[PDB]
Design a protein around this ligand. Structure first.
Ligand SMILES: Cc1cc2nc3c(=O)[nH]c(=O)nc-3n(C[C@H](O)[C@H](O)[C@H](O)COP(=O)(O)OP(=O)(O)OC[C@H]3O[C@@H](n4cnc5c(N)ncnc54)[C@H](O)[C@@H]3O)c2cc1C
Ligand SMILES: Cc1cc2nc3c(=O)[nH]c(=O)nc-3n(C[C@H](O)[C@H](O)[C@H](O)COP(=O)(O)OP(=O)(O)OC[C@H]3O[C@@H](n4cnc5c(N)ncnc54)[C@H](O)[C@@H]3O)c2cc1C
Ligand SMILES: Cc1cc2nc3c(=O)[nH]c(=O)nc-3n(C[C@H](O)[C@H](O)[C@H](O)COP(=O)(O)OP(=O)(O)OC[C@H]3O[C@@H](n4cnc5c(N)ncnc54)[C@H](O)[C@@H]3O)c2cc1C
Ligand SMILES: Cc1cc2nc3c(=O)[nH]c(=O)nc-3n(C[C@H](O)[C@H](O)[C@H](O)COP(=O)(O)OP(=O)(O)OC[C@H]3O[C@@H](n4cnc5c(N)ncnc54)[C@H](O)[C@@H]3O)c2cc1C
Lengths: 323, 300
């Protein structure tokens, strides 16, 4: 209730890897920052962050730990869903959906905006999605950079959401030649791509998936709608991404293929709004998002600091004055 | 040694270790050469790298174990020289306090070392340096907030750091150690802001159990301080890159976004490249360089 009338220096939409880094930096610059996080984001479904020094942690540990740091240094935190943003010319107003049912819709104010809401991987749609979630993020992966190492020389299914996504096989084959391409029967494959799959020895299965097969979160097969199946040691879902960043529509941000175009310090085309991580154009890795938070937080602090009056040691000046 | 590595990494701190984990997880053959006791080793608390505050010692030890676990090679040595034959890099290494290794790509990840004030007994400096006597303002300004702070400036130009430190604390004393004259304009500006200027040589840092609480000068007088910031510049010892005619700006190596330098197939990470000196930046640099390299190799 005070949070609402308080003018923040910065509001961060999204409290994942990029937003939490930005929040710790801004708090340690002694700036007023509010983080708004809806919960259950992409990094949360990451079982193992394999490649972020110095320690392998779960995505849950990453988020809880970053949140604890941000709060310890003075950031404010709001469990809510960002709905809309307006730049009044003087400030950003951010409308937030609060509570899941019978919701309030508070509006917070800040001088700067950081968009750190990331993306969500499209998944195959089975009647019982728990069958997918049983394996997704374990040995059924969504990111090749993230898990190609674990796929090395293993029997791999590539689930492609479009004909263009089949091209992922010709990068996956860096790690494993034992690739089967699954379309789920969702789209036609032209003969040209057929010939290329045939040249490389990658079978093409166009049947809908009935079920992922396995035990204790280890997939070992896939059953199709006709009751035939294949044995696999691993898989990669390449079906695109959803961003649900409509809250940015009033800002007329320059985009490229869904990603927000930024400068090196993550500045967007709209003054005083920054874009971090999986939402900006670039590699989608935790390391990248965390570093984006560093650059944005530092850019904002430099702007505010260079516009501020110098803090003088007034005691010596006043005492000499009085004498 | 007889194996042609895909890449040799000079320096096994934050950025070099990040690159090594990525490269090994690209199933590339990679060698890290690390001399030990670098800048990050002396960091007592990494405050601002989510999700966990760790010592610099823990950062390096953990990163090294990860790189080895995914298949990187590691050598405790000092990189001396590099030759680009046109086909490969030859990297000569001083081992024990002089083998030559070969690779297709070079990552320069050797960072820098903060200049420290030179007292007769440096152990007195090391007692406090990296604790509440800081070397990086972005890293530790938060902890200095509104505390009595000494700024040890290695040159007149470094005195300008006071006018950024003052964001965190206005209670600034500026120490020159008597190493240079200070011009009237800078004198006026310090006095206008109320920041004492002390031009005496330092005898000793004062404190207990790694907590500095004062500074004693050569004439036997002292000041009380709760914290301090050293701003005396940096040393790189990057002569091993001398033959590659890399483009530089003030000692920092200039790179593209993906850390490519002016010389093909050599990258530069972290504190050694032009940019912010933070762990987060170095680690992401490692990600970008390793991925650019994998992409070149994969397309070849
Ligand atoms: C590898 C991977 C593994 C996954 N595993 C699982 C799993 O195991 N179990 C599971 O459930 N999902 C899992 N998912 C997530 C799944 O794909 C969907 O993204 C997810 O189920 C969306 O849930 P949702 O309906 O709440 O959508 P959301 O986008 O989260 O929510 C939809 C609506 O709910 C409201 N809302 C959301 N949050 C708030 C909030 N804090 N406050 C107020 N209102 C809010 C809003 O109106 C919003 O538009 C996984 C995803 C991936 C990539
Ligand atoms: C299974 C899996 C394994 C992975 N493994 C690795 C790995 O090993 N190494 C690596 O680098 N990367 C890995 N990744 C990718 C990694 O998670 C992302 O690259 C990273 O999380 C990017 O951070 P972000 O901040 O940009 O996005 P996120 O971390 O996802 O955070 C964005 C935040 O925005 C929140 N949010 C979204 N919309 C709203 C809204 N309207 N209102 C409020 N909040 C909102 C979300 O809930 C989320 O918390 C993995 C990803 C997955 C699914
Ligand atoms: C905040 C901070 C705190 C610090 N605290 C301490 C402290 O507590 N104790 C301390 O000693 N220093 C401390 N230092 C470091 C100090 O300032 C010097 O930089 C450091 O001590 C130099 O050690 P060195 O003589 O090995 O020089 P180095 O540069 O490390 O080595 C000099 C020479 O030794 C050879 N050599 C070095 N390493 C190898 C190797 N693995 N194999 C073969 N040959 C090698 C080479 O010919 C090289 O040129 C601290 C520094 C900072 C910034
Ligand atoms: C006291 C202190 C506290 C700090 N706190 C923070 C913080 O809180 N947050 C933050 O972001 N940053 C902090 N920093 C800065 C941080 O340490 C650097 O930004 C970071 O380490 C940069 O990584 P790097 O890989 O480039 O360099 P480094 O970590 O320094 O690694 C370079 C490596 O190269 C080795 N090496 C150098 N030369 C050679 C050679 N010829 N041959 C072989 N090996 C060589 C070195 O021994 C070293 O290990 C702190 C720094 C200090 C001194």
């Amino acid at each position: 209730d005070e949070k609402q009338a308080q003018l923040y220096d910065v509001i961060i939409a999204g409290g994942g890897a990029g937003g939490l880094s930005a929040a710790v930096y801004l708090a340690r610059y002694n700036l007023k920052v509010l983080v708004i996080e809806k919960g259950r984001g992409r990094s949360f479904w990451m079982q193992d962050l394999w490649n972020y020094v110095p320690r392998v942690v779960s995505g849950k540990e990453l988020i809880e730990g970053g949140k604890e740091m941000a709060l310890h240094y003075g950031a404010d935190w709001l469990n809510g869903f960002v709905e809309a943003v307006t730049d009044t010319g003087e400030e950003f107003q951010v409308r937030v959906k609060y509570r899941f049912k019978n919701s309030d819709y508070p509006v917070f104010r800040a001088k700067y905006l950081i968009a750190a809401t990331g993306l969500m991987d499209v998944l195959p749609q089975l009647e019982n999605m728990q069958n997918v979630y049983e394996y997704a993020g374990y040995n059924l992966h969504v990111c090749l950079i993230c898990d190609g190492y674990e796929m090395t020389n293993r029997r791999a299914a590539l689930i492609a959401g479009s004909e263009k996504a089949i091209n992922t096989a010709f990068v996956l084959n860096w790690f494993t030649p034992y690739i089967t391409v699954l379309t789920l029967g969702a789209y036609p494959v032209g003969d040209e791509m057929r010939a290329k799959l045939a040249d490389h020895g990658y079978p093409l299965i166009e049947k809908p998936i009935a079920r992922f097969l396995g035990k204790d979160h280890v997939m070992d097969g896939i059953e199709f709608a006709d009751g035939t199946s294949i044995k696999v040691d691993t898989g990669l879902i390449s079906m695109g991404s959803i961003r649900h960043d409509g809250y940015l529509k009033n800002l007329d941000l320059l985009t490229d293929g869904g990603d927000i175009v930024t400068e090196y310090d993550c500045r967007t085309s709209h003054p005083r709004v920054f874009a971090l991580g999986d939402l900006k154009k670039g590699l989608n890795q935790v390391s990248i998002a965390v570093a984006d938070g560093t650059l944005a937080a530092t850019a904002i602090w430099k702007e505010i600091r260079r516009a501020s009056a110098p803090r003088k040691w007034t005691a010596p000046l006043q005492e000499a004055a009085a004498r």
